[PDB]
Write a protein that binds this ligand. Structure first.
Ligand SMILES: CC(=O)SCCNC(=O)CCNC(=O)[C@H](O)C(C)(C)COP(=O)(O)OP(=O)(O)OC[C@H]1O[C@@H](n2cnc3c(N)ncnc32)[C@H](O)[C@@H]1OP(=O)(O)O
Ligand SMILES: CC(=O)SCCNC(=O)CCNC(=O)[C@H](O)C(C)(C)COP(=O)(O)OP(=O)(O)OC[C@H]1O[C@@H](n2cnc3c(N)ncnc32)[C@H](O)[C@@H]1OP(=O)(O)O
Ligand SMILES: CC(=O)SCCNC(=O)CCNC(=O)[C@H](O)C(C)(C)COP(=O)(O)OP(=O)(O)OC[C@H]1O[C@@H](n2cnc3c(N)ncnc32)[C@H](O)[C@@H]1OP(=O)(O)O
Ligand SMILES: O=c1ccn([C@@H]2O[C@H](COP(=O)(O)OP(=O)(O)O)[C@@H](O)[C@H]2O)c(=O)[nH]1
Ligand SMILES: O=c1ccn([C@@H]2O[C@H](COP(=O)(O)OP(=O)(O)O)[C@@H](O)[C@H]2O)c(=O)[nH]1
Ligand SMILES: O=c1ccn([C@@H]2O[C@H](COP(=O)(O)OP(=O)(O)O)[C@@H](O)[C@H]2O)c(=O)[nH]1
Ligand SMILES: [Cl-]
Lengths: 217, 217, 217
């Protein structure tokens, strides 16, 4: 027996629950296991879009040794804190992908990724902990994505790009390919704004916007 | 018995007819009913891409009580005029979606929408009359789309956005999320240009272009 | 009997090999024929992502009358040189598309196209020799694409656009529709930069960037 959950019942979680259902019902062929929302805003259980939603205290109390959780919270510092709590409590992080999520050859993705519909992870890609690839995003050949990286929808991450931990890439941003000799680096905790056209390395902690991408003033 | 049509045999209709065929042949499992084009430019019937195409006078004359029409005319003032004519004539508006159109939980869409391939309508979205969602567009969580709204291809409509009646959103435009306390409003009859990066409310009747979006001068 | 290959085992080829496998194993229903990489950087054969990879001398030496090659080299002058060599050697150019590639009515595509996943080729489109349509690109109604044209991922090529030979369209670029009376022309060997918003004809050999697109200075 197993129990599944989506941690976060706000906009991120509500648009991931259908994906978690494709993962569980179709890709794992599991029509038996329950799936719920976990949300720490809750005191008493409620329902969200026809799913039971409970706080983490109540989820822990469920008498099952085999719990699997997708963290659907876009803020990556919260996501890391939750992931460390879940692993410490003996709960498994659970990667979810949609029926239209495309994974190519020699891809490595750490447990707990949220891979939305129409996402492509292309050849020879390595991805770290609890990656969020929102709708239509791609990661192309030979990229290395670090831990707790977050893509908004429709991110174009071209080949030979290294995105360091906790970076955020905004809606529709486009990133120029690197080369094998010089991968294009998005630094730790950088924020690439929606619609940014990134042609050069982004420093750690920088916020860049515009076409072409410049530091936000 | 039933008869189906795509109203408009120009570029919009010709790229929607295959979608109307996925809707009818696969999603409704209907291999019997005829589907035609209606176009008021026609005097004598012609064929368009192997489909009979006729004017509305001839379509009305068809002796069938059960007619279903998708309006494939991008101009929303024409679309409203046609929709009101069809309903007055006792003809049903017909929503079409592709095999790759993704609809999530608790979505409401008024009859007569044209939902193209690779479109996502995410959680808890409400959409009004004869919506056009062209190829690759998405509407994310908790959006409210009004009547006769038109998306070009690849529109990124993020969460908590309210698009009022007759707005037009151009190819590849990206719209920043609102919040539940302050939804981001695109005003009635506004035009968001192709590639616009919208970070703020757009006034009724405004035309905005650029990154970031500004009034067209 | 037949043998298949992807010519180019770098990033372009490695992200096309899974597509060539969808084309061969699923769309042609062929679980028998071998598929390999050809790459002229090789002296001795190697393996790339679990596929035999050999130089063109070794591929020619294979005793099979029935060879089919997809050229997965983005540089269109190299692609033309290879295509002419293959045809002169009596080897067939091979169009590949993914399971999620959408082709609409009355489309003509010359042999040897690389049509990636999530690509749409819409109604009444004509495409010339060895077209590259990378991930998520579309070509909308009544376009004419010439020979050895290359789209990066997520190109939005709207209706009534004529793209002349050897043009390159960069990641996420958006091109305004033409009209039947005035198709919007992208000239021979033009380069449209990633994220460019093209609202006007692009001269032959021009390099354009930005929103709106201007000559690169
Ligand atoms: C389904 C979903 O909804 S997932 C959510 C997806 N959302 C996104 O991708 C949005 C990502 N966020 C952004 O791009 C943000 O705008 C940021 C991070 C770049 C800036 O955020 P803030 O610092 O809060 O910026 P704020 O909104 O106050 O605007 C700052 C200024 O920069 C401009 N600006 C903000 N974002 C951008 C952008 N992406 N491109 C160009 N200009 C921008 C604003 O218009 C404003 O201009 P002003 O000085 O003329 O008023
Ligand atoms: C399958 C299909 O084809 S569906 C059709 C999809 N099509 C689209 O999404 C296009 C949507 N339309 C647009 O973006 C239009 O360009 C509009 C509505 C913003 C402006 O239209 P018009 O007022 O007719 O603008 P026009 O083409 O005359 O150009 C006005 C000026 O603004 C510039 N411009 C026009 N559109 C844009 C844009 N989206 N972004 C930046 N600049 C623009 C033009 O280059 C021109 O500049 P100039 O003064 O240097 O000559
Ligand atoms: C899976 C894959 O990876 S497929 C590969 C997909 N890749 C792409 O689509 C990238 C297409 N290429 C481009 O857009 C290129 O940047 C080109 C062709 C426009 C310019 O290339 P180059 O001439 O080598 O430009 P370079 O990178 O030296 O930059 C020139 C200047 O223009 C700026 N720039 C470059 N490209 C762009 C762009 N697309 N938009 C705006 N500005 C740009 C650069 O930041 C640089 O600015 P600086 O003068 O401030 O330093
Ligand atoms: O420690 C936490 C932090 C946040 N949340 C929930 O995560 C959801 C997501 O919150 P937010 O709107 O910040 O993020 P989003 O849905 O956009 O990622 C909210 O319902 C929070 O109550 C939680 O359950 N535990
Ligand atoms: O009252 C109308 C108005 C327009 N059209 C047809 O709708 C099609 C679409 O016209 P247009 O090119 O303006 O729009 P699009 O295909 O881009 O939406 C044309 O063939 C028109 O003849 C029609 O049949 N009746
Ligand atoms: O005549 C040629 C030219 C190039 N290549 C190979 O094509 C691949 C693609 O090279 P490049 O990185 O220039 O292009 P991409 O993968 O981006 O198209 C490389 O492995 C080259 O060795 C080849 O086999 N024969
Ligand atoms: Cl897309």
């Amino acid at each position: 027996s197993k129990v599944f959950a989506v941690y976060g019942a706000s906009g991120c979680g509500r648009s991931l629950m259908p994906v978690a259902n494709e993962q569980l019902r179709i890709l794992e062929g599991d029509t038996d296991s329950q799936i719920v929302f976990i949300d720490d805003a809750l005191d008493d259980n409620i329902t969200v879009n026809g799913y039971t939603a409970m706080n983490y205290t109540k989820f822990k109390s469920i008498k099952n040794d085999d719990k699997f959780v997708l963290i659907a919270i876009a803020n990556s510092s919260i996501r890391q804190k939750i992931a460390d709590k879940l692993v410490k409590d003996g709960i498994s992080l659970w990667t979810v992908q949609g029926m239209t999520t495309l994974i190519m050859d020699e891809v490595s993705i750490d447990a707990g990724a949220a891979l939305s519909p129409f996402v492509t992870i292309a050849a020879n890609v390595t991805i770290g902990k609890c990656f969020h690839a929102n709708l239509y995003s791609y990661v192309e050949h030979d990229c290395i994505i670090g831990d707790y990286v977050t893509f908004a929808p429709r991110v174009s991450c071209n080949g030979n790009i290294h995105i360091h931990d906790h970076a955020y890439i905004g809606t529709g941003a486009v990133i120029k390919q690197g080369t094998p000799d010089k991968p294009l680096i998005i630094g730790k905790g950088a924020i690439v704004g929606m619609g940014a056209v990134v042609t050069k390395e982004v420093p750690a902690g920088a916020v860049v916007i515009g076409n072409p991408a410049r530091l936000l003033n």
